[PDB]
Symmetry: C6
Subunit: 129 residues, 6 copies
Amino acid sequence: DMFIKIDGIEGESLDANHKNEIQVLAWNWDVAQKASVSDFCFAHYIDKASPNLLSYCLLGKHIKNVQFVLRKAPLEYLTIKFTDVIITRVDMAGSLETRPREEIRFSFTKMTQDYVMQKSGVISANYDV
Amino acid sequence: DMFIKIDGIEGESLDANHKNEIQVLAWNWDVAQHKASVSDFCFAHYIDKASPNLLSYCLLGKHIKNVQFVLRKPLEYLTIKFTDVIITRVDMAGSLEDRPREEIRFSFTKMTQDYVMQNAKSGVISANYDV
Amino acid sequence: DMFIKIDGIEGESLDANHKNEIQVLAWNWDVAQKASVSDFCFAHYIDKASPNLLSYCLLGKHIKNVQFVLRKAPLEYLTIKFTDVIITRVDMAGSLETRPREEIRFSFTKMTQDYVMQKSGVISANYDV
Amino acid sequence: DMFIKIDGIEGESLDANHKNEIQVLAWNWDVAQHKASVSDFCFAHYIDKASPNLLSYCLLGKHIKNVQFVLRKPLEYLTIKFTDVIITRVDMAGSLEDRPREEIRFSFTKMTQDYVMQNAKSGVISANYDV
Amino acid sequence: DMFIKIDGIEGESLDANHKNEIQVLAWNWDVAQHKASVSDFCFAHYIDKASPNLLSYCLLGKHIKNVQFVLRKPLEYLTIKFTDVIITRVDMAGSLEDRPREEIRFSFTKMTQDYVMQNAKSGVISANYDV
Amino acid sequence: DMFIKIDGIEGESLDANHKNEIQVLAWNWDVAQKASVSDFCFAHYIDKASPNLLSYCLLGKHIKNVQFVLRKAPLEYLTIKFTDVIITRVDMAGSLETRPREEIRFSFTKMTQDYVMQKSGVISANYDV
């Protein structure tokens, strides 16, 4: 299970620990070679958050915190937290065979990546621009 | 179930609530921030009653006042309404591994997107935009 | 069933209503953005019309009328008629698994697109350069 | 069944009517009008008796007088004959998911294409062309 | 079975002989002669204990003294050891059709490659190279 | 069965007639339009020859003769012999599902291509730069 919590933009997950967050279907992020850091990318079904992701994109409205979480099917073993997020792309599509989905890309000035070991410690990275 | 209702251009859906609109097979649309860059709306349908009218409006650059696109579960949970539409592309194709189909792309000056929530509606979340 | 009737260039269909016309296997056509109108494209097996499509292509010989028809498997629900046609490409290929086929592209100065409703009216478009 | 007979370069077909010609696995050729632009004729065969001769003629730019390509149902229903041929390309390849094979492309100054009709022949329709 | 042991960056393999190293899912590396052009070494692993450290070293341009990559049948038949490594790329991705994974590419100033032969070891064949 | 014998660089085939040569998994070569002659290309599993192909590549060390042979599954029906060979590329990769493999490309100043007919004669080609 994968979830993303976006300040001011609710989704519709019915998970007990992530109520009203966005269920993530796919994601990616990369960093190359002072480094070149790409937009963070996720996919979700078109849902409650969709019209607000579109507005925020179209306006360049800033989002204070975003939190992305991966859970084993129930340890939340990976957490990435982002600051000063800007929604930079919204891509939607559907066909006749599940619901339509949308891919979102966003920028950020800071991040923290926490990985949780087992129950042992935590290993972490962060970055700033 | 997906429908598009285009002013002046009837389709041939036999759905009770969408009689004579166009049944949509697939669609896509995007927006990116380098003012947003907003793509043409794209959809596919079988070649039908609407096709020759769509081809004319395209060839002539003829404006269309209102277009309404709807997805349904049976809740109509997403509606996108576009204003002042111009048909920018008509691509048709068929093969023995079919009915032939056609992709339509179009311009617009404004749009509204409404997502409708329901509980076991409660409400609608909306966005709108204007060139 | 799909058929194309080309002035002066017979095919070998044994259909009762389209005797000696060309059976079409695939086709496409597109129009974009005064519009940009592409060549009309069809595929057929290499047949009686093939050497004449090749000659006409190689010479730039003009063809007065071409008629393309789609039939439900028997209403002829779509008709496209073209004027002043030029054969602009001939592409042939085969393998070991049905017969070889050939793709033909042609230009035209005019067209009429008739769609037939049911039995009701007709809706039509045309264009000229 | 597909055969190519190339002057001076025997293959190893064991077909009765095409003894010692080259069996063809695939081919293609095209012509487009921007004088027509006419592509090299292309075919594939297994690496065989003809291959090292084909490779020599290519390397040397050696002219070949006549090449005859035939498709058969058993009516030989299409024949293309080429004149003054130059081998412009030899690409060979093999893998454990085989016999290795080789694609050959060639130049020509003239060609004739004959399509033979039969009823339950009646005739032939032909085209020819000359650089 | 494939392992990579990276100085200062533990993984979480539970293999007896490679405890706390990184299990590798796929890799690639090449060298071409136009001094040879030598590519970054590339590998993939599941997102694990090593990932945030790998991401830090990348972001900072932090040098890593020794990296050792091993393939095993159970003979460890190929070992490549690299010296003075810099992490040049970190690409991560997940989907519902999974654990997410991550590709890592890295720089190096020297490497040694040993291939170990055995009979029913007898020996090792080696190559080494230095920028 | 496909084999390649490289001067000074042994492989590990256990075939009786090609003991200690390199088992080839795939190969290709092409010649186009004085002709443009590509590098000869073969794939093999990472094996005894691998570290020496890498060294020779990295040094530009010359190899006097290379012999490539194809055998029916046992007539050796095709032989290509190369002179003054240079290893120009080494590309390795593996995954979780047989062993890793490596692709090798090499240059040469001369070659002879012998094809064996049946038992009849031989047909041959060669080239020099």
